[PDB]
Amino acid sequence: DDIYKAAVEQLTEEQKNEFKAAFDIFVLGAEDGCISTKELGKVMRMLGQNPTPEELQEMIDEVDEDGSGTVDFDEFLVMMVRCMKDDSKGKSEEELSDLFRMFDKNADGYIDLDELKIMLQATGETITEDDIEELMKDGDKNNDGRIDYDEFLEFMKGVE
Amino acid sequence: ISASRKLQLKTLLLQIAKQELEREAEERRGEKGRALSTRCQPLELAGLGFAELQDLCRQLHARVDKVDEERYDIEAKVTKNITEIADLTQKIFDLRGKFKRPTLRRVRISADAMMQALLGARAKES
Amino acid sequence: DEDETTALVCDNGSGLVKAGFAGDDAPRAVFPSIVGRPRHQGVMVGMGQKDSYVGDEAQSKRGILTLKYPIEHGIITNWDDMEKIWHHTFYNELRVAPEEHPTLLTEAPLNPKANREKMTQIMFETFNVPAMYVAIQAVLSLYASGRTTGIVLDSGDGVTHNVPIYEGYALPHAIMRLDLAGRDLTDYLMKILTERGYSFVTTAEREIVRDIKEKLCYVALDFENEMATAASSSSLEKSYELPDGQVITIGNERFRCPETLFQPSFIGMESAGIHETTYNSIMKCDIDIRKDLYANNVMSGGTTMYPGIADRMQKEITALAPSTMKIKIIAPPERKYSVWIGGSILASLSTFQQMWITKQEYDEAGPSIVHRKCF
Amino acid sequence: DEDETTALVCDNGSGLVKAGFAGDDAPRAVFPSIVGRPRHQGVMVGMGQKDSYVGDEAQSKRGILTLKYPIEHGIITNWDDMEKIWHHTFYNELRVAPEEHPTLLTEAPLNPKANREKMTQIMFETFNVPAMYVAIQAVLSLYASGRTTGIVLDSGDGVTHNVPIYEGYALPHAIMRLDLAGRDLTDYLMKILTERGYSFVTTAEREIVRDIKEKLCYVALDFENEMATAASSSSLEKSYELPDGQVITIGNERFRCPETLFQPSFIGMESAGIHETTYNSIMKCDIDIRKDLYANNVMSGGTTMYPGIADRMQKEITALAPSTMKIKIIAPPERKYSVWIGGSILASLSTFQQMWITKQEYDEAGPSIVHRKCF
Amino acid sequence: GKRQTEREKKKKILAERRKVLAIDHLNEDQLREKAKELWQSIYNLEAEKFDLQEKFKQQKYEINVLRNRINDNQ
Ligand SMILES: Nc1ncnc2c1ncn2[C@@H]1O[C@H](COP(=O)(O)OP(=O)(O)O)[C@@H](O)[C@H]1O
Ligand SMILES: Nc1ncnc2c1ncn2[C@@H]1O[C@H](COP(=O)(O)OP(=O)(O)O)[C@@H](O)[C@H]1O
């Protein structure tokens, strides 16, 4: 999600205005102003594609943040950036392995909170406590408080 | 924090890690230079006569055999580590296998083609 | 978008052809393995009209065409017709020329070698593909399902192959192929619908009965209970709409068609059915293999799409199986398309690139090379 | 991972290698002396899959492997497989680097010198051990048991050595080397289970029968009474679960197998039997020794764990023994593990610190040094 | 057979890598060049040894990470 959310933040106002015009086509006549599988299917067919009901439900589930079963405009912008890549290929595991070693300052095999904090400060961006805590919670999937090698690869998946 | 902020931090984190990797390589090259200065010191040939030069060549040749044996010994340890790395890599892959085979979809109609079809000439920035 | 010389993937069966690009998760389109030909004398001129029609063209213009299938009971019998099926698949709908892409074609484990040899020959000689590989459908089904181990029960349109795999290895002595498949089930249905007063024999009619089967059959986990009621009351009949506005209602015949998979004698086949071949593939494997195969019967092919077959199969295998043992069925949404999906998985593996037959290897050895390099 | 340069101890039998470090009272793990190899052709791509599996890997993946042991009645004949077993033992599970530790291995005193010379050679030449010792299994069980005197009866998986020791001394003229062990008992059981309708031939089946014997069998204090009863009533049957959910029940076969130890003729062997070889090792010793060996019939290894064996062996010797003499079996819980345990004790004795072959002594002396320094 | 071969083999390899030197047909100037050539060979071997030592350290790190991943995923 994070790489796509960043791409959305960076869209210009004119680009968002064009996406809004497209969104309005998709939700024309919808009871709640949102895109359900009935509006998504009618547009995909209008576009020449023939998705199954399951494919349509999965396209919505991939960006549905509230659990509405529908796509709102904010969710739509994520759908539209996900449908395109600037970040093609996305590197690979061998390159992430060498980068992992650079985060692991004590060479223990894990990235701890102090290591993460040192690396974040080095970026030059203002780092708040919330930036540190949130990235470590996003990375450490087993709740030990550290990022292992396999968690690091999931953590940096798709990051250019 | 927004996911958009997290991405920017992750992209900058990877850029610094890459810089540190280059830094490590440069430092290792410096370390290599110094190690070689100690292990393989320069020849002093001035003043050696013919017989002394013949003995030096024999002495250097003998050293070549000894260094090659030391190199062999480290190489053997490196070789054993490759076998272990290959076996552990297969083990982790299998432990981390199960239900995780990945897929891609083509339901993701490119937003460029979609925008040209739905908006026509209105579609200029996207 | 395709900005990389990705391998092309196509599964060519006796029924339909699944095709798309490696790296996608579905065929882009499914092209029936049909070449249609006009069977009437023309009167108007300047009407276009082809010598032959293919895939969806063959079905769209079928009102006056006889429709032939180049593939039967698992093999290609007419490879000149397949060159046209493939040409259309690649150049008209996928809009890709194989000349710039490796191509992956698939077959059953004991499939006659002529099938893989002609698949290899046509793609190298008429399409000039830079590389070829013929894969095993059972591998691909396991790849789509997230398995390395299980019984692949692949009843399709022309054949049921039935092949056990353990840790990625075939157990060939435990393969039990049957001449029992969806095409025969269609024929069984045509005969019993004839008994009801709806006699279907011509191409248009044969295609209708196939369509009826696909939409109305539910197989029945308990067929004795279903025949007792379905044959006694209209409350279990389903109405089907025909192209000319006619309606046919089907009762116990609705499940008697699929029943042939459990009672093959219905179509003249000497067999114990699909649930027993699944079971025998487990039983001919060693006892330290059997436990994993019992827990992983893997559904592939198309008969796996009846609303009730997973229960019909689990009930039959567990009935044949020893007690204590846990008998399970793996029946993912990747149903009917698991070979194509597996094809995309295989084609895109880094561990598969050395397995390709290159055009240079082909030109030096000829098509028999596929028999030596693939499996 | 050890914090001291403690000697390593490994008991390499035809069955399992017991291994751990000196100073403990048990091995860290038991590593079956098995190297497995796939016996099938792979079909799926990207499955990993190695040419061979070792120890517990060999048993865990056995469903498609052929499993072989490198040790034949106490002698290693397949050294490639033992290097894999030893490497796995130190490298993955004991978490040991032999380069930093003396290593003690064990062996029957009656085996060909080739085995003790080669074991000395591999630890010094392949594992770079700083020191070596190969110890006698009669000695090792006696140390573990707290004894200096007795007849040590292994009845193991590989060999029965039948060796009398008095006041720490060997009495070699009284030794009965016997070619009868658990590996033969297992084959006998497979033939009599075949008589019951359960045919066990292949590796999975051979490992099942060895498991059946280990969990269901006994010798019987009185064979004929158990024989007549078990042959007459189901009350003497015991069940076993086969891995595929099927079951087997075993009747008099439950004891007919173990009985071969007392009756070697059951497998075509020409032998006195373990109770007579034990007896003859006492009998052939001097008249003032006999009384101490009668009172010290010492168990070693496995099979000494069978119900009725400690009571039966004492009765069988008593029946052959002169009156006045008091006959006793020493059957400690340190059973099936006493040889390894003795190795731990021996390696650690202050009186044994000079018995170790050092690397320098080995390099100067050559492999024959084991004959001058160990036994 | 094979273990003896492995011990003989490391020595055989090292013997194979031993070149034959002769210093009698060479004059003083050629001997100085020959000495520089042997020195450079030693230098290159020491440089290769250094690279292997560095690799060995990265390998120990990688092995420790793999062991931790296995222990955490088991
Ligand atoms: N819901 C269904 N009910 C009954 N039969 C079905 C159903 N879905 C597919 N089939 C049949 O399965 C066969 C298609 O098998 P499939 O594996 O998906 O294509 P192929 O073998 O050519 O790759 C056809 O005979 C089709 O009529
Ligand atoms: N409880 C038991 N019942 C029957 N046989 C046994 C039992 N325990 C051990 N044995 C047998 O003894 C052997 C294992 O004992 P062990 O001496 O530890 O082998 P090793 O010499 O390799 O260390 C096997 O053949 C096993 O069948």
Q: What secondary structure, in 3-state letters, does D13-78 show? A: CCCEEEEEEECECCCCEEEECCEEEECCCECCCCCCCCCCEECHHHHHCHHHEEEECCEECCEECC
Q: How far, in Å, CA of A77 to CA of A16, rounded?
A: 8
Same domain, D313 and D173: yes
Chain E CB within 8 Å of residue A152 CB: no
Chain C CB within 8 Å of residue A54 CB: yes
CA-to-CA dists, residue E51 to A95, D7, D14, E57, angstroms: 20, 34, 44, 10
Give me the number of domains chain D comprises. 4
With beta carbons less than 8 A apart as the criterion, state whether D103 and D131 touch.
yes
Contact flag E49-B91 (C-beta cutoff 8 Å): no
Q: How far, in Å, CA of D274 to CA of B126, rounded?
A: 91
Closest CB to E61 among A107, A148, A150: A107
Q: Three-state SS for D79?
A: helix
Q: Which two tokens stand for residue C239?
A: 């109405």
With beta carbons less than 8 A apart as the criterion, state whether C56 and C32 touch.
yes
CA-to-CA dists, residue D322 to C98, D151, D273, D315, D319, angstroms: 94, 17, 19, 13, 8
Where helices occur in A48-156 by DSSP H, the ranges are 53-61, 73-82, 93-103, 113-121, 129-139, 149-155
Whose alpha carbon is nearest atom 5 of ligand 1?
Answer: C214
Q: Using a 6 Å cutoff on CB, does residue C254 contact ligand 1? A: no
Same domain, D202 and D261: yes
Same domain, C63 and C77: no
The span from the first CA to the last CA of chain D, in angstroms, equals: 31
Strand pairing of C75-76 and C71-72?
antiparallel
Chain E CB within 8 Å of residue A109 CB: yes
Q: How far, in Å, CA of E48 to CA of D192, rounded?
A: 64
Q: How far, in Å, CA of D248 to CA of D261, rounded?
A: 24
CA A124 to chain centre: 23
CA-to-CA dists, residue D248 to B35, C44, D184, angstroms: 70, 80, 21
With beta carbons less than 8 A apart as the criterion, state whether D76 and D105 touch.
no
Q: Is residue A88 annotated as involved in ligand binding?
A: no
Ligand 1 centroid–CA C93 distance in Å is 22
The span from the first CA to the last CA of chain A, in angstroms, equals: 13
With beta carbons less than 8 A apart as the criterion, state whether D125 and D117 touch.
no
Name the experimental technique.
Answer: cryo-EM
Main-chain phi, psi angles of B85, to 5 degrees: -65, -45
Q: Give the closest residue to E68 by CA, choosing from A111, B20, D86.
A: A111
DSSP assignment letter at D164: E
Burial label, D3 (beta-carbon count in 10 A; 0-12, 13-18, 19+): exposed
Please list every protein residue whose CB sits less than 6 Å from any atom of ligand 2.
Answer: D 11, 13, 15-16, 18, 156-157, 182, 210, 213-214, 217, 301-303, 305-306, 336
Kindly list the residues of chain D whose beta carbon comes within 8 Å of any beta carbon in chain E: 79-80, 83, 118, 121-122, 125-126
The residue out of D18, D46, D68 marking a domain boundary is D68
Residue E21 parent element (H or E) = none
D-E interface: how many C-beta pairs under 8 angstroms?
Answer: 15
Residue D240 parent element (H or E) = strand D238-241
Task: Give the largest CA-CA distance in chain A.
Answer: 60
Q: Could you tell me which residues are beta bridge partners of residue D165?
A: D150, D170
In angstroms, what separates the C-alpha of D196 from chain C's closest C-alpha? Answer: 18
- In angstroms, this model's resolution equals 4.8
Same domain, D121 and D96: yes
Taking contacts as CB-CB distances below 8 angstroms, the residues of chain D near E2 are 79-80
Q: Three-state SS for D239?
A: strand
Q: What's the alpha-carbon Rg for chain B, to the nearest Å?
A: 30
Same domain, C174 and C111: no
With beta carbons less than 8 A apart as the criterion, state whether E74 and A142 touch.
no
Q: Which two tokens stand for residue C133?
A: 């590989």
The count of C-alpha atoms lying within 13 angstroms of the C-alpha of C244, restricted to the half-sphere facing its C-beta, is 6
Same domain, C285 and C235: no
Chains in contact with A, counting 3 or more C-beta pairs less than 8 Å apart as contact: B, C, E
Contacts of B104 (CB under 8 A, 6+ apart): C23, C24, C25, C344
B-D interface: how many C-beta pairs under 8 angstroms?
Answer: 5
Q: Could you tell me which residues are beta bridge partners of residue D38?
A: D65
With beta carbons less than 8 A apart as the criterion, state whether D162 and D178 touch.
yes
With beta carbons less than 8 A apart as the criterion, state whether D338 and D147 touch.
no
Contact flag B84-D91 (C-beta cutoff 8 Å): yes
Q: Is residue A4 annotated as involved in ligand binding?
A: no
For a ligand 2 pocket test, name from D336, D337, D338, D344 the mutation site with the most ligand atoms within 8 angstroms of its C-beta: D336
Q: How far, in Å, CA of B23 to CA of E63, rounded?
A: 23
Q: Give the closest residue to A96 by CA, choosing from A159, A6, A142, A146.
A: A159
Q: How far, in Å, CA of C368 to CA of A91, rounded?
A: 39
Q: How far, in Å, CA of D132 to CA of D374, rounded?
A: 9
Contacts of C254 (CB under 8 A, 6+ apart): C216, C217, C218, C230, C236, C237, C238
DSSP assignment letter at D91: I
Q: Could you tell me which residues are beta bridge partners of residue C240?
A: C248
Q: How far, in Å, CA of D298 to CA of C353, rounded?
A: 63
Q: Give the closest residue to C267 by CA, choosing from C359, C182, C162.
A: C182
Nearest atom within ligand 2 for CA of residue D301? 17
Q: Which two tokens stand for residue D320?
A: 């052959």
Q: Could you tell me which residues are beta bridge partners of residue D76?
A: D71
Chains in contact with D, counting 3 or more C-beta pairs less than 8 Å apart as contact: B, C, E
Ramachandran bin of A109, using left for φ above 0, alpha for ψ from -120 to 50, beta for the remaining angles: left
For a ligand 2 pocket test, name from D303, D309, D312, D339 the mutation site with the most ligand atoms within 8 angstroms of its C-beta: D303
Q: Which two tokens stand for residue D289?
A: 């020794």
Q: Could you tell me which residues are beta bridge partners of residue C151?
A: C164, C297
User: CA torsion D250→D256→D257→D259, rounded to 10°?
Assistant: 150
Domain of residue C194 covers 182-267
Burial label, D239 (beta-carbon count in 10 A; 0-12, 13-18, 19+): exposed
Q: Is residue A160 annotated as involved in ligand binding?
A: no
Residue E19 parent element (H or E) = none
Query: Looking at residue D328, which CATH number applies to its domain?
Result: 3.30.420.40
Q: Using a 6 Å cutoff on CB, does residue C335 contact ligand 1? A: no
For a ligand 1 pocket test, name from C305, C309, C335, C338 the mutation site with the most ligand atoms within 8 angstroms of its C-beta: C305
Ligand 1 centroid–CA B74 distance in Å is 61
Q: How far, in Å, CA of C127 to CA of C116, rounded?
A: 16
Which residue is associated with the tokens 């001291």?
A: D4
Burial label, D269 (beta-carbon count in 10 A; 0-12, 13-18, 19+): middle
Strand pairing of C53-54 and C35-38?
antiparallel
Which residue is associated with the tokens 């064996």?
A: D309
Q: Do chains E and C touch (3 or more CB pairs under 8 A)?
A: no
Q: Is residue A151 annotated as involved in ligand binding?
A: yes
DSSP assignment letter at C375: -
With beta carbons less than 8 A apart as the criterion, state whether D105 and D135 touch.
yes
Same domain, C20 and C162: no
DSSP assignment letter at C92: I
Q: Three-state SS for C67?
A: strand
Same domain, D254 and D347: no
DSSP assignment letter at D368: G
Neighbours of D288 (CB within 10 A): 8
Q: Is the dihedral of CA C123, C125, C127, C129 positive or negative?
A: positive
Main-chain phi, psi angles of D75, to 5 degrees: -110, 135
Nearest atom within ligand 1 for CA of residue C12? 22
Q: How many residues does chain C have?
A: 375
With beta carbons less than 8 A apart as the criterion, state whether E65 and B92 touch.
no
CA-to-CA dists, residue C195 to B109, C189, C199, C253, C257, angstroms: 48, 10, 8, 10, 13
Buried b (16+ CB within 10 A) or exposed e, C187-216: bbbbebbeeeebebeebbbbbbbbebbeeb
Taking contacts as CB-CB distances below 8 angstroms, the residues of chain E near A101 are 58, 61
Q: Is the dihedral of CA C87, C92, C97, C101 positive or negative?
A: negative
Taking contacts as CB-CB distances below 8 angstroms, the residues of chain B near D50 are 90
Which string of DSSP letters, residue by residue, matches C211-276?
HHHHHH----SSHHHHHHHHTT-GGG-EEEE-TTS-EEEESTHHHHHHHTTT-GGGGT-----HHH
With beta carbons less than 8 A apart as the criterion, state whether C260 and C267 touch.
yes
Q: How far, in Å, CA of C25 to CA of C27, rounded?
A: 7
The count of C-alpha atoms lying within 13 angstroms of the C-alpha of D319, restricted to the half-sphere facing its C-beta, is 10
Q: How far, in Å, CA of C27 to CA of B50, rounded?
A: 81
Q: Three-state SS for D179?
A: coil
Main-chain phi, psi angles of D30, to 5 degrees: -110, 125
Chains in contact with E, counting 3 or more C-beta pairs less than 8 Å apart as contact: A, B, D
In angstroms, what separates the C-alpha of C148 from chain D's closest C-alpha? Answer: 8
Which residue is associated with the tokens 């396991």?
A: C142
Chain E CB within 8 Å of residue A55 CB: no
The residue out of D225, D247, D267 marking a domain boundary is D267
CA C84 to chain centre: 20
In angstroms, what separates the C-alpha of A108 from chain E's closest C-alpha? Answer: 8
Helices A53-61 + A37-46 axis angle, to 10 = 110
Q: What's the alpha-carbon Rg for chain C, to the nearest Å?
A: 21
Contacts of C6 (CB under 8 A, 6+ apart): C21, C22, C23, C101, C347, C348
Q: How many residues does chain D have?
A: 375
Contact flag D126-E4 (C-beta cutoff 8 Å): no
Ligand 2 centroid–CA D155 distance in Å is 9
Ramachandran bin of C276, using left for φ above 0, alpha for ψ from -120 to 50, beta for the remaining angles: alpha
**CA geometry: angle at A57 spanning A55 and A58, to 5°?**
65
Q: Using a 6 Å cutoff on CB, does residue C302 contact ligand 1? A: yes
Q: Which two tokens stand for residue B42?
A: 């320069």
Taking contacts as CB-CB distances below 8 angstroms, the residues of chain B near E51 are 32
Q: How far, in Å, CA of C280 to CA of C284, rounded?
A: 6
E strand residue ranges, C42-102: 53-54, 65-68, 71-72, 75-76
Q: Which amino acid would we find at residue A57?
A: Q
Same domain, D250 and D348: no
Contacts of C185 (CB under 8 A, 6+ apart): C213, C217, C257, C258, C260, C261, C267, C303
Same domain, D101 and D222: no
Whose alpha carbon is nearest atom 2 of ligand 1?
Answer: C214
CA-to-CA dists, residue B9 to A89, B4, C169, angstroms: 20, 9, 46
Q: How far, in Å, CA of C320 to CA of B101, rounded?
A: 32
For a ligand 2 pocket test, name from D157, D212, D261 the mutation site with the most ligand atoms within 8 angstroms of its C-beta: D157
Q: Is residue A50 annotated as involved in ligand binding?
A: no
A-B interface: how many C-beta pairs under 8 angstroms?
Answer: 132
Which residue is associated with the tokens 């116990």?
A: C252
With beta carbons less than 8 A apart as the criterion, state whether D22 and D8 touch.
yes
With beta carbons less than 8 A apart as the criterion, state whether D74 and D13 touch.
yes
Chain C CB within 8 Å of residue B124 CB: no
CA-to-CA dists, residue C254 to A11, C180, C214, C226, C259, angstroms: 55, 18, 10, 10, 9
Residue of D nearest to E70 (CA): D92
Contacts of C169 (CB under 8 A, 6+ apart): D38, D40, D41, D42, D43, D44, D49, D64
Same domain, C17 and C58: no
Q: Could you tell me which residues are beta bridge partners of residue B116?
A: none
Query: Looking at residue D253, which CATH number applies to its domain?
Result: 3.90.640.10
Q: Is residue A31 annotated as involved in ligand binding?
A: no
Buried b (16+ CB within 10 A) or exposed e, C25-42: bbbbbbbbbbbbeeeeee
Q: How many residues does chain A have?
A: 160
Which residue is associated with the tokens 């580590």?
A: B81
DSSP assignment letter at D7: P
Query: Looking at residue C60, which CATH number applies to its domain?
Result: 2.30.36.70
Neighbours of D29 (CB within 10 A): 16
Same domain, C276 and C171: yes
